[model samples]
Target: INRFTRRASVCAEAYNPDRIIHPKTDDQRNRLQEACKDILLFKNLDPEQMSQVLDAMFEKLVKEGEHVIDQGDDGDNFYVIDRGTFDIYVKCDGVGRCVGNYDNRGSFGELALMYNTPKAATITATSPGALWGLDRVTFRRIIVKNNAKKRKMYESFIESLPFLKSLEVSERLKVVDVIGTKVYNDGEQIIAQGDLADSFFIVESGEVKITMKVEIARCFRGQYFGELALVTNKPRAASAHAIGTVKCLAMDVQAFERLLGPCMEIMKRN
Candidate 1:
């Protein structure tokens, strides 16, 4: 069975963009076709999802040397490169230096998709090309749906943690719903020493090494660290570094209150 077989039923409601009628211009239709095919960002989507995503996109043409992203400017839209090469440049000490280049099917400006931030780098088309673009409002709504799906997956993992055996299935689900999931790229740091900690985290996948004050431990799937801050509001006793690519579920102090706030006094008395 496939890894997603448990959710295989989702395929039933899957989005099928192929059913969408081509746009008026053959050029537009062809570009859309290429977009749906080459982008892994769209790989798991079904027809309904695809249609909703398509509706958010508008076709655009750019000529060679067109600047797609301007350094230091607030990013509002994300773009997928359908064809042509584009150079990525960053200003270091006020000097523009070309750091990278991408050709066909590459994408840029993803910061706008997650949250508002200044353009980290400038992107300029090296040749004429077509792009499918989505702005902040639409991008965020789509991410909300994706985040909900991932939350469910993390909740399932959390239930399997042996240390959390005191909790029942329903209780575990409640805890998961209130927390948020975080993804860390390989080698990313999860926590920093002496930082004011406002959250707790549980590892769902990949590996993390914990250095809590004077003690150190390497934690893998289903292991959780960082409970001290959640309970005591203390500064992080230790730092966590990702051993590799990792996914973790975290709950802020505010979320903890929402999840188990009312019973705090009762639990303390017990």
Candidate 2:
């Protein structure tokens, strides 16, 4: 079906029988540990945690001026640039604008994991860079299996919602199944305007603002927005911009349908 699939088939048949297993030496292990240490997500993870983090993760090198994500494309993975610099350019007010930049240890495309939104900007490597990537499905599955604290926090947040109070235990569990958490640094855009909305969110901690007309109209915590898009099947009504360090739960629309069915009536009444 794909190039990767076709290559794998040929490789499988042409594989050599005299395969040699090389034991990893202490030097190699130590170097690997050192390299992974700078990875923010893996730095504090434990043995089990490390295993899960590395399971579906992949790393690749990009040359300078390479486009990591185009202006308009489906984003299915988040990337962490380990070396070199990156530039983000978005068409703003009908003109191209450099909106953001990042160096080593910098991560982007997070909303790719949160929602089925298009690439917000064109991110290109300014120099040859090493990048580590993780797909949304794999990362979420790992967290669900290994992170008890996160799972409980998400559960409690959903149950406490008045709109979800009418749901039965089974229904509530379904809601819990679809939702996951994301932590964003200061001044990050959580939801961008003019994008197809495919999910709803609830803030578990920290504060964020609802932005419209380039102005923050309101900000709140332990509160939720992004409902307008999910309920109306319309583009996001307003962008949710983070004020400072913020954490929130992102829920998928298909998962929501499987969990709570249609919620327009419930949302409108609320």
Candidate 3:
């Protein structure tokens, strides 16, 4: 029997040590970011995480006649066309034809990474230009880990709000898509007493101080304020200030409205 509790019970899954970082020009990173914004895989990554994703995306310039992905070949890369035109052929035996196509800002080859399938189509480069690509490991490490961790925290934060509990599982997911974090410095103004309420806020970290000149109340982690304003669609009742380095996950009033529109009856009863 070896000692020391077998090195302390169980080891968590190790982070990917070999994170890929590519050096590229500003245009290389910038041009593809707007393209990246529309991707579902990257939807949940916070700003810093998105920056990491950008740094990890390696750039490659393909020739006009280059075959980008081959049908029946193992898909190793997810590609975003930064400045190119491409043709996608679904069948194995057709190079001179096109079943589908791609222009600038188009992306492809995610099926293999997403579902463990081989490349569904062969992509041939029609115009020579730059491409931003993330390999399977890079894709999984940054995108999957960031998204997973992000989703977990949002669940914890969102669940603390009483109103969001009105939403069921899939409905919760809609709110997840709209959740964005706002950081406030110490003594910074968070919400004004008479400003039109555009958002509902949940304290993710640090603390928020409610004020009427003197500090009246404070909200800490998981406790949310500012619901009444959004509910009434009027200006906020009290101004809120940041106690320290407060991080709030703000769910927009528009989001609240859209979220409740489908189940107004269910919410009304509640």
Candidate 4:
């Protein structure tokens, strides 16, 4: 067995905290939470990390006809909408095209932020409103480093499962990125039998105790359950409880549905 160690040569530098705090009112803070909720950029972040991101954001007042970002060059900030209309003008060249618009929606310039390429689109608000800007250093430190670490550990745990092993390398990589974390108290119910299910969990720390009446089965670390629900869109097959303070790698239904279309199809070949 030639154990291959790939994709690990570039050692991840430490996350030296370069926190830039721009203050906001309590309502302003909470508003950003719902407005930018699940901004793919923050998918792997926990509440405290989320707060750190919130702290880093600086609110920019937008007047009518003001441009947030031009498709001209590299972008410095990822912008989350506050309220009102912002038009997205795009180009594959030839003077560009009007692709879409944002109202009460998630952030833009996220693609540009990740890619470091020229902004694919220019965005401007037609109505006077507000926007929140997250700087590159903050996004790079908190999101890039932490997410890469999580991605690395998950790949380690993932290959151990035959079900997921059916996936191609990049197939596995895509699935791994959106994974989040959850914790359950000891003796607390995880998945209730017959309840609707949307996500799956893999034990990261403590065991999962599955029960019909009493002690039906136990899931050790690295084992997973509730996956069938994502595909079937069905009720929970079993009631799973936490044996102790259990922590897990979690995948919600949204990304699973979006990314795992061909993944399930490929796995079906087995």
Candidate 5:
């Protein structure tokens, strides 16, 4: 089964975005931005999309010794710790054992946003604290929609690449699933020459300058680079810098190995 299959169960509760108070001041919005940055699940989100997410979240205050989540309870909200520490525990042999802690900026209960899942662990406030929470419907309506759009865009680009032309539809879809985007400002180095390469990149928009001792080439939309390094395990042969603000679809080596292994192996053979 696919990774998303585990989160296929539908949530029974209806969620209302209107119930949450949107961030008001620059400070409040900035706090939300910082909290979003600390979570990998929100990494793909851009500034405007993050703002939309912030609008769907409301502040929640918990007193010291209060439980934020109880193990085995149905999850309804995704939380980001804003101002305190929380102890995490999971039941083992009918006893709750401390597993770790979540501090300011830590996030938890993301699975609740994707599926009707039971809280896997218990989280209790170690100190009087505040957090921001987004309900499942708003998360699905905002973040998931944006992510889906980007995935579709990445899949379209993958289908156009000459190197990936021989891959089956399923293989291409697998590649699309792990693909992520990175933005580069003008003059910023994307790949430094002589650095060990761990990712392959495709220019989704804007331009990239390829340099080796001297400027060798400029790449634009539909162009890709770094695949040779993914296969060869060599240091980057050339450096790439953004010519303007650029967006690239990136696939890391680990994902390449896991998703399109056979196709990459076949390409390596020739």
Candidate 6:
């Protein structure tokens, strides 16, 4: 019997401390990956990384008519629907209006894990259902820890590249701090021809196609591009588009010049 359970007799299934379960089989891990794929917050994470996140979640069971969440209440957990449907409603002029329903494999309350915010709507189980939940503290901890690990890995790779070999250890570190990652979906343009050059990019995974009127080229993992952009004021000579799903590490020109000095002047003089 927790505070939540006491508030609503119907919330009898409020998370039980003694019954948490983590994915333990290959099949279970695969299922977790599939459930997480369509979640916007988890799209940046790969299948292997998502499996690690799955280990932090706990399961909760709710009976029909039970309130999974109450509008205007403080939110502490994020949830993903696993078994049945739940109806969503929001208060309007002192009345509750049905907005939508989340069925199997659907997710809700994710913003709760990202920040300290009041729940936006009320969600009630329409039928006996099961859900996977993760607390905000655990979610933030995992993401922060993993991001640090990834930053170090990215630094190591950049240090090994020939073009960057001349950079001192400390300089390389500054470069790493300013680097960021972005994903482009199939057919999405990463950089358009004639656009002002403002960033440099390195292909981390998948493929990017570079196209110019009569010329075309492909970039794969470990390949780098837009180097000239960092040292020149010229507009992009060609457009870069994702072939499928592409991931890349990007460094903006302002940061590049601030840390590496005015390489643009040197490039022009040469």
Q: Name the best candidate (by TM-score).
A: 5
lDDT of 6 by residue, 1-270 (tens): 465665422211122222234754576456656777777778887554576688888878899999988888857788877778889999988887999998766776777776655789999999999888888777766676776777766887677665566676787788888788889999899999999899878899999888898447788887777766765789999999988999999988787887788654433442
| Candidate 3 whole-model C-alpha lDDT, 0 to 1 | 0.75
Colliding residue pairs in candidate 3: none
| Residue-level lDDT tens digits of model 1 in 185-220 | 887989998887777788878998887644488878
Give the candidate number with the greatest lDDT: 5
Where is model 1 poorest over a 10-residue stretch in terms of lDDT? 10-19
lDDT of each: 0.69, 0.68, 0.75, 0.75, 0.79, 0.77
What TM-score would every model get versus the actual structure? Answer: 0.43, 0.43, 0.56, 0.48, 0.57, 0.54
Candidate 6 runs further than 4 Å off: 1-21, 24-32, 153-170, 177-270
Tell me how far the alpha carbon of residue 71 in candidate 5 is from the true structure, in angstroms, after superposition. 16
Give the clashing pairs for model 1. 14-46, 14-47, 15-46, 15-47, 16-46, 16-47, 213-237
Candidate 2 local lDDT, 39-93, one digit each (tens): 5555766556665555455766789999888887746777766577889899866
Candidate 6 weakest ten by summed lDDT: 10-19
Off by over 4 Å in 3: 1-18, 92-96, 147-209, 213-238, 242-246, 249-270
In every candidate, how many clashes are there?
Answer: 7, 0, 0, 0, 0, 0
Per-residue lDDT tens digits for candidate 3, residues 94-116, read: 34457877877688765544544
What tens-digit string does per-residue lDDT give for candidate 5 at 1-270? 476666444544544433355655688677777767766667766876777888888888999999988988847788877789889999978787999997776877877877677889999999999988888777777865676677665687887766676666777778877688889999999999899888889998899999998888789998898767556788899999999899998888776777657345645544
